Design a protein around this ligand. Structure first.
Ligand SMILES: Nc1ncnc2c1ncn2[C@@H]1O[C@H](CSCC[C@H](N)C(=O)O)[C@@H](O)[C@H]1O
Length: 196
């Protein structure tokens, strides 16, 4: 929960011109900190090859590198987001790679997946391609989703059908912001582990 990490993550540049249909909002520092600290504390970051699905501006990627990831592979469909991503990860040059294309087209096996995927509120089931890919390329997955009864039921069922079990689920409220009001939603930060 390191508030220092959250603070440092909040200093990164955001999206130039957010495409709402792609749910482009930078992962809030607090939620990002929670997910990363949890993964770090369980030994799922340091020295690991990490894939950041829907990397966007690179908040999760930066935090992972900051916490000792051996390397991070940033998967993002929008080039304009990658421009910001590259600048944000400037101090970790050579330690990250970028895959510009749809998440479903990426297929490199990694040690860990971390992601703040679209919840699927702008486009039906937009989050499924991310969960499917994450389950496909890794044995440990960290993701964020809407803390709603229907969503929770689905996530639990979907991961199971794909051979994964939820080992941790942390619930927090995030605020998605010239200068005005926040959209305050409650999300669950999940940690999935491949059965046996
Ligand atoms: N089909 C798809 N394939 C790959 N990336 C996608 C996608 N649909 C949406 N995205 C990307 O998913 C990202 C997640 S939203 C927030 C990312 C956040 N800035 C962070 O630092 O983690 C968006 O930036 C968006 O462009």
């Amino acid at each position: 929960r390191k508030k220092e990490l959250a603070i440092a993550l909040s200093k990164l540049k955001g999206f130039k011109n957010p495409k709402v249909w792609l749910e482009q909002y930078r992962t809030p520092g607090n939620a990002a900190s929670e997910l990363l600290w949890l993964a770090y504390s369980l030994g799922d970051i340091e020295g690991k090859v990490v894939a950041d699905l829907g990397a966007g501006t690179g908040v999760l990627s930066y935090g992972a590198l900051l916490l000792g990831a051996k390397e991070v592979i940033c998967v993002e469909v929008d080039k304009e987001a990658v421009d910001v991503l590259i600048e944000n990860l400037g101090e970790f040059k050579g330690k990250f790679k970028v895959f510009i294309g749809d998440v479903s087209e990426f297929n490199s096996r990694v040690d860990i997946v971390i992601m703040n995927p679209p919840f699927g509120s702008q486009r039906k089931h937009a989050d499924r391609p991310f969960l499917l890919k994450a389950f496909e390329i890794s044995d440990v997955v960290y993701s964020i989703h809407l803390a709603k009864p229907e969503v929770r039921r689905f996530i639990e069922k979907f991961s199971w059908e794909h051979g994964f079990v939820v080992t941790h689920r942390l619930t927090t409220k995030i605020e998605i912001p010239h200068r005005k009001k926040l959209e305050r939603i409650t999300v669950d930060i999940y940690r999935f582990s491949k059965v046996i």
